[PDB]
Write an enzyme that holds these catalytic residues in place. Structure first.
Site, PDB file in Angstrom:
ATOM      1  CB  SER A 145      -1.072  -0.019   1.216  1.00  0.00           C
ATOM      2  OG  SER A 145      -1.779   0.936   0.797  1.00  0.00           O
ATOM      3  CG  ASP A 242      -6.091  -2.038  -4.768  1.00  0.00           C
ATOM      4  OD1 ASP A 242      -5.167  -2.090  -4.708  1.00  0.00           O
ATOM      5  OD2 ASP A 242      -6.000  -0.405  -3.846  1.00  0.00           O
ATOM      6  CG  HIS A 288      -5.540  -2.286  -0.276  1.00  0.00           C
ATOM      7  ND1 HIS A 288      -4.831  -2.186  -1.925  1.00  0.00           N
ATOM      8  CD2 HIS A 288      -5.125  -1.999   0.701  1.00  0.00           C
ATOM      9  CE1 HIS A 288      -4.370  -0.804  -1.009  1.00  0.00           C
ATOM     10  NE2 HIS A 288      -4.431  -0.763   0.327  1.00  0.00           N
TER      11      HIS A 288
END
Ligand SMILES: Nc1ccccc1OCc1ccccc1
Ligand SMILES: *[C@@H]1O[C@H](CO)[C@@H](O)[C@H](O)[C@H]1NC(C)=O
Length: 342
Positions: A145, A242, A288
């Protein structure tokens, strides 16, 4: 268990001035080193950062960090959990700078908070050289991330740091997980927050990308498809639907035609930006992050798992029969790949 070490240079700090640090588990029979950057969004002004300090303080301070952490996924030492790099030296670098790993500014009478992400990475590397990193053959800078975008912003600076310190034989590579975003039109009505954050943080971007976009436009270098062509270090990209991308696009999942086309176009655009990225893994799933999840071994593209694709990447850096490195789904809807996470 990886064990905590607070940085010996106490002027390299988390947002609130407390020392930054890293968690380490050594493997003396190995010359491979895995340095993982944690994610967790960011903050871009005084009021927004004050909010984060109240309810996300471990991402702004080391005062309450535990002395150990369990290695999971690519940070596991168990071959069954980590077919790729189970015998490597393992490092987990906590994210306590709220600056997508780009900052280089201290706390002062002008600055309530310190934003030192780029300098934290440099100092971790420098202190690890005295604990064994001097003998490495490969340093893999990985992250998820905000940490995945952090790989793209920092991998070439790490390579430069080691060359200038006199270690030209250490091969520096990057692995960016769920950090490849699009500056697209929202479904219902992001670049502003980054533009403001970079001034707030004194944020730094890679030199070749900075020179392309020039003053005032460095925010462009936070977007993978714009910064990746400027990079010299080998970088493997893990990313089609995502959930953080869809959250910023104001999409929340009986789907009408307008949203169907929006979702299908987003997947096609992501696919397009990866066409000329030779080391990539991009499944058609709504999810994610992946690389430090324990079940990261389950997902496959065209029959090949992520640990296998990373192993094939290693072999390519010594096309390979039956061991592919570029794996992008072609089907156009979330979960059209049967192996997507539940
Ligand atoms: N904040 C940020 C941080 C890193 C890289 C891009 C960024 O722009 C915001 C953004 C745009 C699209 C999808 C997700 C996030
Ligand atoms: C500590 O870190 C700061 C910030 O990078 C740097 O200015 C200083 O040189 C470091 N101290 C030592 C002794 O290396």
């Amino acid at each position: 268990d990886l064990r905590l070490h607070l940085l010996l240079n106490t002027s390299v700090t988390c947002n609130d001035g407390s020392p930054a640090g890293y968690y380490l588990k050594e493997s003396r029979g190995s010359r491979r080193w895995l340095l993982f950057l944690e994610g967790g969004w960011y903050c871009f002004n005084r009021e927004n950062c004050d909010s984060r300090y109240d309810t996300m303080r471990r991402l702004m301070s080391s005062r309450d960090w535990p002395r150990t952490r369990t290695g999971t996924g690519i940070l596991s030492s168990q071959p069954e959990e980590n077919p790729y790099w189970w015998n490597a030296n393992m490092v987990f670098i906590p994210y306590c700078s709220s600056d997508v790993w780009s900052g280089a500014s201290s706390k002062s009478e002008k600055n309530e908070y310190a934003f030192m992400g780029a300098l934290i990475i440099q100092e971790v590397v420098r202190e690890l050289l005295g604990r064994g990193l001097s003998g490495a053959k490969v340093l893999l800078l990985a992250g998820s991330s905000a940490g995945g975008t952090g790989v793209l912003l920092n991998v070439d600076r790490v390579a430069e740091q080691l060359e200038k310190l006199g270690y030209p034989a250490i091969q520096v590579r990057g692995l960016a997980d769920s950090g490849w975003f699009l500056d697209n039109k929202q479904y219902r009505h992001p670049t502003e927050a980054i533009r403001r954050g970079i001034r707030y943080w004194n944020g730094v971007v890679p030199e070749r990308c900075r020179r392309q976009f020039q003053e005032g436009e460095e925010w462009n270098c936070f977007f993978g498809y714009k910064v990746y062509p400027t990079l010299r270090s080998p970088v493997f990209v893990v990313q089609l639907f995502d959930e953080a991308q869809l959250t910023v696009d104001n999409v929340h999942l009986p789907v009408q035609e307008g949203l169907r086309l929006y979702i299908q176009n987003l997947g096609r655009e992501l696919r397009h930006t990866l066409k000329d990225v030779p080391a990539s893994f991009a499944p058609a799933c709504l999810s994610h992050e992946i690389i430090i999840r324990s079940h990261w071994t389950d997902v496959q593209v065209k029959g090949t798992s992520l640990p296998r694709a990373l192993h094939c990447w290693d072999r390519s850096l010594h096309p390979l029969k039956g061991c592919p490195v570029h794996l992008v789904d072609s089907c156009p809807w979330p979960h059209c790949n049967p192996s997507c996470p539940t």
